[PDB]
């Protein structure tokens with residue numbers, strides 16, 4: 023009902039563009055009747071105003087009544103106006119996370135009633151919101167209106183509403199520093215550590231300040247009670263959790279059923295520790311239609327069963343205490359899966375999460391662990407404005423050996439070793455110098471670009487030699503095949519000389535996981551050797 | 562009174578994401594911005610401003626106070642015609658030839674000059690909110706901002722008037738303005754040089770300018786490609802020597818490797834000792850005299866961007882090359898130490914500072930780090946008021962070996 027006496031936000035069209043001039047399609051008599059009734063009510067309430075014939079703009083209107091109801095809705099198609107309207111600043115950078123909330127004695131939800139219709143539209147822009155209710159069979163001139171408030175479906179409404187609420191709340195915020203107010207869409211979530219009586223007094227004073235600016239909110243009888251159900255979460259007085267999750271039991275799983283399941287598992291993973299989705303995600307790889315049935319592999323069945331067990335008993339997170347440190351612990355789950363928990367007091371988790379190994383990468387657990395530390399660090403700065411102290415399953419010596427030899431600059435903030443197997447380690451190490459009394463293999467690999475045929479082989483200082491033929495190969499594959507040949511045919515100590523910077527760079531980084539069968543084959547050989555020296559020579 | 566600023570046609574103002582900031586940096590920024598808004602330097606803005614430029618908080622070189630650092634890299638690229646073509650500050654060739662170069666921050670000079678009303682919208686920045694409690698605190702500039710290349714370009718006439726008596730009284734001192742700093746070079750004895758710096762600080766002080774730091778560009782001698790001096794030479798040693806010489810054959814004209822290639826005749830054991838011939842030893846000595854001299858045929862092309870590559874050599878050592886065309890080096894050097902990210906930010910600042918002194922422009926860096934690792938931490942150790950362009954590379958296994 024009220025329209026805020028707040029100052030308007032000046033709005034422009036995109037440079038070089040004029041307002042929309044989209045023709046109104048003739049409508050049925052029942053649709054015209056409904057629109058006239060709706061519009062007469064909005065004009066009465068100050069939301070829209072009748073315009074003269076002068077205005078050359080037009081945006082189409084439609085009337086929709088759902089068959090279960092006898093209520094008509096006015097629908098305005100602002101697609102053309104939105105395309106011609108200036109860009110606005112983004113509404114929010116992120117979304118509030120429950121783990122980042124501090125515990126409050128009392129918390130109140132105040133949702134603004136008819137939010138957009140309570141905020142005025144820039145007087146110079148109103149003319150572009152012009153719409154026409156057509157006459158019966160478009161016989162005579164239609165009834166023309168323009169908006170005076172923020173229209174539903176218009177590009178600028180969310181940002182202009184938000185900045186209006188910010189400008190309004192500003193004095194109340196300055197005068198009440200101990201009251202927490204979260205702004206989200208049409209809502210205000212207000213918390214305090216006052217005794218219940220003065221919290222209700224402060225809430226009435228806030229609602230009264232907002233009413234002074236045209237914003238209506240619910241009173242004591244109508245305002246929500248905990249637990250608050252918000253954006254897939256449950257907010258209880260001293261704990262939070264994700265809303266109920268039911269994992270369906272189907273005879274046949276479709277691509278759509280599996281996508282829905284993976285989304286629910288990912289959503290539960292922010293508070294249920296150990297949730298895994300690798301095997302279920304592998305099933306979604308490919309060119310498969312939404313309703314196509316994908317049989318579960320034994321591995322996806324194993325993973326689905328493990329998830330059901332985790333989710334069988336409800337799990338909650340605690341709220342944040344800004345006067346304490348955040349501790350993040352990470353565990354290796356196998357096959358590139360990593361799980362983590364963040365707590366302040368052991369072991370009452372604020373939240374949990376997971377990290378997965380990058381696809382098609384030659385990599386090791388030290389690199390995956392560094393990536394997981396980085397992901398957690400960034401997420402922590404977003405939620406709490408600080409980095410946690412880490413507890414990692416890697417020895418200080420293993421990390422020290424890694425970072426001192428790696429070509430890339432790498433670092434982990436404050437951390438301590440925690441003995442939680444499986445531990446993170448490097449599975450082989452290249453020699454620093456050529457091995458004496460070890461056989462030197464001068465390996466070679468080449469592939470013809472036209473026939474795609476390759477040859478991979480070696481010549482040794484001891485007289486040994488081999489050449490093997492390969493089909494539908496590349497230079498890269500033949501130079502990895504040549505290194506693999508020397509590994510297969512050598513003793514426990516071997517000096518290998520290659521012309522490949524490609525192969526050298528992969529092996530030098532001590533990978534132990536690869537999507538390439540050939541790299542994995544080389545890894546198996548490297549682990550088994552006692553001493554391997556690898557050198558590069560120009561062609 | 563204000564100088565009208567136009568963007569490059571076809572390009573719009575910056576719309577860069579604000580990177581997450583810690584609570585202490587946010588509190589530092591809210592305090593600085595509250596004070597600048599009281600003074601009218603900046604103003605709160607509405608949502609009808611769709612522009613954004615990232616903002617950070619760093620520790621000053623002179624104190625333990627927080628300072629605002631705005632990343633205007635995108636706005637600078639989008640106004641390159643104004644600050645470079647329209648109002649270019651010429652680069653003096655004599656600056657790198659000076660015994661001492663002192664770097665003075667003069668960024669406080671710009672707060673006295675109002676910004677063109679129609680350009681203010683492009684200087685929008687946001688102070689983020691922890692856990693998205695509130696929408697970001699949005700502001701735009703009302704005066705010439707620090708970090709924007711149009712600022713010294715506009716202040717140029719005022720700076721000339723400020724420096725006129727000092728320059729007239731000290732004709733052999735070179736003063737060069739780059740972004741928010743003055744580079745003051747002289748051939749005076751260090752104590753006489755410092756006295757002139759303090760005298761120049763008094764001149765700036767009369768115009769409200771209350772005042773890296775001490776460089777010696779004449780003592781800058783490039784790190785050559787180093788060939789080892791050995792008593793005995795294994796097969797492996799000669800192969801590494803050939804690889805390193807093959808690399809400098811593409812750079813330096815006249816490098817020879819025929820006689821040393823002849824020594825690797827066959828498929829010998831890597832550990833096997835090979836005696837050096839008279840011819841290969843002469844060839845080795847001739848290559849050493851070429852490597853110790855500057856590269857013949859390599860010249861700075863002002864129409865091309867400078868590129869800087871850095872390699873981590875272990876034990877707190879880092880090497881670097883500055884070039885425009887790959888491997889046609891304009892400068893080579895080394896940096897010595899702190900954690901890896903701290904050492905790397907320090908190397909980037911040292912290399913950019915030398916680049917500003919030699920060419921009057923910053924290089925685009927190829928950083929040997931993970932994008933996310935660098936992006937999270939670089940701000941903890943940054944002390945400069947400028948920021949260079951950077952990208953992330955996977956240092957080739959032998960580019961490191963050729964520059965060890």
Ligand SMILES: Cc1c(C#N)cc(C(F)F)cc1Oc1c(C(F)(F)C(F)F)ncn(Cc2cc(F)c[nH]c2=O)c1=O
Nearest residue numbers: 118123125126202204211212213248250252257258259
């Ligand atoms: C109501 C609400 C909702 C909803 N619906 C959604 C969000 C979302 F932003 F996280 C926040 C939000 O408001 C809360 C805030 C607050 F900070 F925002 C402000 F109220 F103090 N701070 C903490 N909690 C948890 C909590 C619940 C309770 F029953 C009693 N005591 C408590 O501490 C909130 O629920």
